[PDB]
């Protein structure tokens, strides 16, 4: 009753999803794509990664670009109260990168990528 819990969805290519497909999946089970709003949540997700041996994997988070006057937003509506972008990111590479992915290594860094790319994902509930 006092927290959301996180769950990794590491998938082979035949079951990977776009950002929107991943958001729809997490919402259909009663949650949303995961937001990382502070260092505590970052640590919780890193611990899940260490527990699963799911090392060096990339995962969709709930980061998505809104209108120009909103900038990057979290799908769950939470504030962008913490940022852990990789160096130079977000860079909107070739003008087509509007969704955020986690690099699931010890840096736990974020990168904007094309929303239609197939990826693993993380839900919260
Ligand atoms: O592929 C687009 C991506 O390319 C470059 O990033 C590289 C690396 O730093 C990333 O961690 C991995 C995983 O996304 O992708 C590339 O190998 C950068 O130009 C990056 O901004 C861009 O999104
Ligand atoms: Ca949160
Ligand atoms: Ca990028």
Best residue for ligand 1 mutational test, from 111, 112, 115, 116 (most atoms within 8 Å of Cβ)? 111
DSSP character string of 56-67:
T-EEEEEEEE--
Distance from residue 110's CA to the centre of ligand 3 (Å): 9
Contacts of residue 77, Cβ cutoff 8 Å, sequence gap at least 6: none
Question: How many angstroms separate the CA atoms of 124 and 32, rounded?
Answer: 6
Contacts of residue 100, Cβ cutoff 8 Å, sequence gap at least 6: 60, 61, 62, 63, 64, 72, 90, 110, 111, 112, 113
Q: For this experimental structure, what is the resolution in angstroms?
A: 1.4
Contacts of residue 53, Cβ cutoff 8 Å, sequence gap at least 6: none
Q: Where are the domains of the chain?
A: 1-125
Question: How many angstroms separate the CA atoms of 22 and 120, rounded?
Answer: 8
Distance from residue 94's CA to the centre of ligand 2 (Å): 30
Contact 121, 10 (CB under 8 A): no
Helix, strand, or coil here: 99?
strand
Residue owning the nearest CA to atom 10 of ligand 1: 111
Contact 103, 86 (CB under 8 A): yes
Q: Where are the beta strands (DSSP E) in the chain?
A: 6-9, 32-33, 58-65, 72-74, 99-103, 110-113, 120-124
Question: How many angstroms separate the CA atoms of 22 and 62, rounded?
Answer: 9
């Amino acid at each position: 009753r006092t927290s959301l819990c996180f769950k990794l969805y590491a998938k082979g290519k035949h079951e990977k999803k776009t950002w929107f497909e991943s958001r729809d999946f997490c919402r259909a089970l009663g949650g949303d794509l995961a937001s990382i709003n502070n260092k505590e949540e970052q640590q919780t997700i890193w611990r899940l990664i260490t527990a699963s041996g799911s090392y060096h994997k990339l995962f969709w988070l709930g980061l998505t670009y809104g209108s120009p006057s909103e900038g990057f937003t979290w799908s769950d509506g939470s504030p962008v109260s913490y940022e852990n972008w990789a160096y130079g990111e977000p860079n909107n590479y070739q003008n087509v990168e509007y969704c955020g992915e986690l690099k699931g290594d010890p840096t736990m860094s974020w990168n904007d990528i094309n929303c239609e790319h197939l990826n693993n994902w993380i839900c919260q509930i």
